[PDB]
Amino acid sequence: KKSLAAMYMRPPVTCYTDACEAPVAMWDGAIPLKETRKLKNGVPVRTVSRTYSHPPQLTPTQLSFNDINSMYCVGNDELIQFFPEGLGGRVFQTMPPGHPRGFLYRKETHLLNLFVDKVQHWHTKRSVLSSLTNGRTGFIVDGPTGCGKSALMCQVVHFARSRNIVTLYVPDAKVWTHGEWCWPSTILPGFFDAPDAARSFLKYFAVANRATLTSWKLRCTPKDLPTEQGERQPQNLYELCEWGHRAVAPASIDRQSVCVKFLMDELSEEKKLPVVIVVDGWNLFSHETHFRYPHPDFLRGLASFNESSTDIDLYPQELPRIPASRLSFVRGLNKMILSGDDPNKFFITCTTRDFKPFDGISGFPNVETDRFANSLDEYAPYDPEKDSHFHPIQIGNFDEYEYRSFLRFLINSGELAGLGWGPLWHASSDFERKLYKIGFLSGRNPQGVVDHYHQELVWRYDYQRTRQKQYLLKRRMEGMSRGA
Amino acid sequence: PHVEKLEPWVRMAEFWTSEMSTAHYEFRKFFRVIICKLPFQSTEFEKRMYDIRHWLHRQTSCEFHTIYRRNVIHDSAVFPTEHDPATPTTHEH
Amino acid sequence: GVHRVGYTHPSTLPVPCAQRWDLRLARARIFQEYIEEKAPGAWQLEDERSMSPEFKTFTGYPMRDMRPGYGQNLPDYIMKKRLPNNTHYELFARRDIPNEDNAMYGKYLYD
Amino acid sequence: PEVAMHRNTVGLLPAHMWETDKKTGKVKSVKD
Amino acid sequence: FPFQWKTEDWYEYEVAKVRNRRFVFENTEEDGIRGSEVTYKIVLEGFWDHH
Amino acid sequence: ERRLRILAQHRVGMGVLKLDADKYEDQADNVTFGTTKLSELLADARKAQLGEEYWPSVELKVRKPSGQSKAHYSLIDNERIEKRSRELYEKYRDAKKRSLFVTPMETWLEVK
Amino acid sequence: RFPPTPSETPATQDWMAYTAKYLDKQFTISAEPAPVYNVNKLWPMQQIPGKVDQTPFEEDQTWLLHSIPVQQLEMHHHEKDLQDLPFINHEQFPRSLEWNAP
Amino acid sequence: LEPCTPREWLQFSHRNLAYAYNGALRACHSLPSMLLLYKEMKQRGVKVD
Amino acid sequence: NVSYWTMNKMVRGGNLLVHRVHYTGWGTDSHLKKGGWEHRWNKVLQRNVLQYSRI
Amino acid sequence: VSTGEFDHPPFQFRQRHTFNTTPLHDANRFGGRTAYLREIGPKKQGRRFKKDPRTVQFNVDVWCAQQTLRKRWKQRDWEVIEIPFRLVPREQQRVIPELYTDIPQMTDPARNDFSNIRNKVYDREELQGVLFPAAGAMLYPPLQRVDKQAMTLDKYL
Amino acid sequence: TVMGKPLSLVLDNKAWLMEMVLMPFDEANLDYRDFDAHIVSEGHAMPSIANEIAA
Amino acid sequence: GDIYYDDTRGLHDRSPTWMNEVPETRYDRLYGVNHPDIAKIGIRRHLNVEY
Amino acid sequence: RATTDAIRAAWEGVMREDVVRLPDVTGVVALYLTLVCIRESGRLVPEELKELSSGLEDGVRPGVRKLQQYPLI
Amino acid sequence: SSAEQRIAGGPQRAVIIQYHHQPFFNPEPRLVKVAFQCDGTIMEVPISDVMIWQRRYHGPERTVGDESRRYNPAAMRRYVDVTDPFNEKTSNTEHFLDK
Amino acid sequence: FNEFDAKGREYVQYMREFARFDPRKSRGNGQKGFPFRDAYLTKMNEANQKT
């Protein structure tokens, strides 16, 4: 009854998140409207405002120590600028194009943000950065499944590319290791390539750091590269990556193997510019890729199948599995890690726990109901101290401080953007009931918070709004009986 | 001695009462175990225990379990500890 | 994958010790265990209906071996099968008579 | 056809003991 | 408390508990009702439970 | 007893070696058959007192080589492959002027 | 049995043997460092040494595409054949199912 | 009333006897009739309300 | 070991001693109520053979 | 706890492709393994085994046991090497019972290590002196272990 | 914890099944974090009890 | 419980007989017990002993 | 380095039985078993109770709940 | 520390502090909390290693003694309250509300 | 009344058994020496729980 919707005016839009506001007929009862009275050329000035506003869109230089366990946002034009590769495995599940692009600023997020602030001028802070990593080349971030691992790694490229630092960002390592098809390297004997993962890597890395790679002069790169009519020979590292991925099929298959090897040769010789290398899921690069070696009868050559002493068409067999060290992309990475002549590259990476569940027995997964349909088929245990040369950082689930800030952003800004209950706010409970309940269902696990936020729709045994509407209808009928 | 409970053997039968209906009758018999622990082997008690079968109840039987200690000799001359032969046995043996 | 099963003699190792295959041959010597030669290393299937404790028909022994087509024609089934001597069939042959008095005495001897 | 049906060649047929038709290709008669 | 375990230890527990059922030494050189020298068990069988 | 627990795998349970003799019809011959199977099992277990060559070996589930050691698999013959890849690049750029797509079978993969 | 164990290809024991034999002919180290003691690929299965045998597969399509016949006739057990069927389960003496033999 | 059958044993509690004994305590009009009801209330096991 | 016609006349005659159960239940043995006929088929195998460590 | 399907659907009249109703022998069920026992048309020994309930249940019990085996072997990041008793570490100098013989044994409760010995996995870089004494060249590098007491980024310094 | 595994993994992270476990706590006006609970299954053992009848 | 420390026995300790299942305890009594036309004494009394 | 393998096997064989029962001794042996025990009890107790103490086993065990701890009156 | 199971010793005089007679509060082997005479050490000893001073041979409860009952010449009449057989509703202590 | 119910007396006996449990005193007990599966396997997962 008390609407206050016609008297509401729209605030002036300054950023992308302020323009994500829905019409006032949607979120009128979802986010209630209060009125404040200012003293402006008259004692009453009725100003109808929202109780909840969007969290502020801040550049990473404006983020501070007081913003720990708070919520901030990024622009959509800042999203397309700093992320041409994409985001992590499950980061973009909370950002449709109507929603603002929010991020939680944790305390481990503040440690990495001040780290890249010292990476930006590393030559004067070299003894500081060596004591932070304990002499290692970088950090590896490990924890349980669904925590802030890939959600932190996309923040690091937001921290570094806003500080105009050249970044190698692998948004998910399962395109390289668990890819579509594997091809041997053209110029590297005994090495292999992921060609579809490489053309997408050589495309988006050129667009991301075009301001820095155009100033990158080619030091160790042969100038007799094969070049068709109308194309210019590359003189920059931006021109080298555009020589690789921009081609016609099947000439793009062998061009990336030349380009990736000469990219890793050019990066390993640069000792002056800081190059942050961020990899989502380094544990996939630390063990065997899911490809296997081909059978030697395929390359040997046969005249017939009946008399050749082979059974390649009769019975399948499991060859030894190809490790990730035999890939041309990871060969250049492991060259810069193990060789101590590069105090310039900082490998702030993480692991992934996106594997399928297996708890003693296993039937067949139902094709309709399978949350792990695009999950990894590995089942292998991983220890980041023993299987990587980086410093392990252990992050757990949320505590109740940042879980409250993350759930306030999910519920309120979803209904403010026209994606939540809206007019059906009276059927769902209040925020203190939802904070108490989802914290039980998730255990403050960050993927479980997002998952049970969508599973708030199918709650059956919540009786808060039933008893409240019974009390208010009882209070109404006695109020009119008092007036009678 | 103390009496120990044992679950009854019960086995049911499913047969026609005629394709009209099915009858469900079960054979069943109940068990009680009596545990007698003596700290010596006496044949006078074993004789008395075996003769309880002659005055049992109607349609009631019994069986006897006897767990006794007995000295066993491992003769290391009849069964010696020898080195393995020069030509060892294979799976073909 | 496809490999050859290896064996190290105790005279070859720098610290000699009894291996696990000649202990298997010593175990097969005592209890007379048949060693099937063409038993495949890849086919080790557990009876998960019985062995797993989170199933309804949980028995700690494998009640059925996971082999399709384990019939009477194979001689390995014949060697490990129980002969029907002094079984319930031997009770059925001597007791199930149309006249129970023809199993406890002769009629001429009783008359 | 369970494992290796693709390895059957035309030399595995006993073509000397039958007579086939010239139009369709099927066997017309059998030899004693 | 509360009881949370790895499942393969639970898989090892439930199989070892049933296979070691009759792996018991009854006549032990010990104290009273557990310890003895000979153990007699008479299994009585009848058609009715009160019999 | 380490040799005795391996030679009698399921016959030993909860510190008690149990032998169930079911070979013969009468129990008197099964006591005799059970006695000689106990003495044959004890005599082969007594070989561990002869020397260390009859001590049963410990089965350790030792891990695969770790990701730190697997990182060095890229640098196996690093200077030889980097020398090799330069002439393989020169073999590649001369063969690109002849055909559109040049496979690694035409560069370094020996097939025949 | 149902898997007819294939022929032993010469260099397929690990990734280094395949790289040194077929991919890179000038590979220095031939195979992975093998210990002096005996490795057990099949575990806890004791296999006859000197016999070419195959490990259990790790992918699902290798278990699917392998020439494994399915059960067609009536299944048989070596001691559950005196008892004819689960409906015709024969018991000689009516002992309890929890009867422990001394 | 002392319950004997398990149907009325499922409706027996010393805290529920507190309400029934207080209703008889308020039904009384004089203290000599009330102190006799109170003494057997605390003689029996009854939670005092 | 009789037919269905002989089993009813032994029940209607009163010779054998059988207890009648409701025709939609599984009787009284807990092994039959748990898994059915196949679970009791495995329990007799566990009693007759698999409880003995064979030599 | 596993949420996959284990039992086979029972036999009734021929199902159709509807809502909450799949045909009885479809390519979606059990990963397409029902093609061995399916009929396309809407020889007596080759027709009746497709319709027997005990026969089709046994084949799914084999296929689920194959899926249980391949996931237990993909979990293995180790291998079993017979190491003699003298060169073995201190926690393996005890009498180890076999599988399903005793209670699941803790490793060493005196040193506050309560874990099963049968799931103990040792790193290969620890036993280079035992597994490879004949090389003498240290074929595997030593494992770089991080200093837990060093002031790093995780300890706000 | 239900049979050694946490409640988010037993009931397969389903909110409409796990909220019935919270229902003894909220109707009592009690906080669930002040109590530890372990539930032992004594009925028919199944690989997944993710249903509303088990909840 | 223990009889030597029992003297005032604890009766009806809320032990749930509905968690356990013994539902089939149906009993069949003879027809016409309180009927005025059916006599109390008779040869139909022998039907009370039949199982 | 202290005793033989036959002594260590005989010592472990006594202490592994179901109930370890103490043997009866002779009178001159009981005097020898007690007098050495009196001499060896000085090194096992702390120095607060070496000279004057209450009982022979007082301070040999780390934690023992005595009945005399509460009634100090 | 070298003993695997336990070591028994000589029987010393002691008093019983507590004895959980319930099978759930005291499983097998049963323990009884005793306090010895010489040093007053409170220990939980097994029930097999205790000895009581019996009063008779055939007794189920051997520690307590026999008691003589009172004799009545005309013992055929004797009045017992059916409602209060143990005289519960009468109070020997006088209350302040009996005025 | 009694102090505990039938399922309450079952699990309160299991806690007293695990409080006095020693694995060297489970020499020849058989399956009676298995020390309360719920609390024994919880101690074996202490490397993963870490309260």
Ligand SMILES: Nc1nc2c(ncn2[C@@H]2O[C@H](COP(=O)(O)OP(=O)(O)OP(=O)(O)O)[C@@H](O)[C@H]2O)c(=O)[nH]1
């Ligand atoms: N906006 C925002 N979302 C977060 C943050 N931390 C966690 N999340 C949410 O938590 C979920 C988990 O994100 P991921 O980092 O991809 O989870 P993970 O640890 O990488 O999971 P695995 O890849 O399986 O190992 C995401 O879907 C996010 O919605 C954060 O700091 N900011």
Ligand SMILES: [Mg+2]
């Ligand atoms: Mg991730």
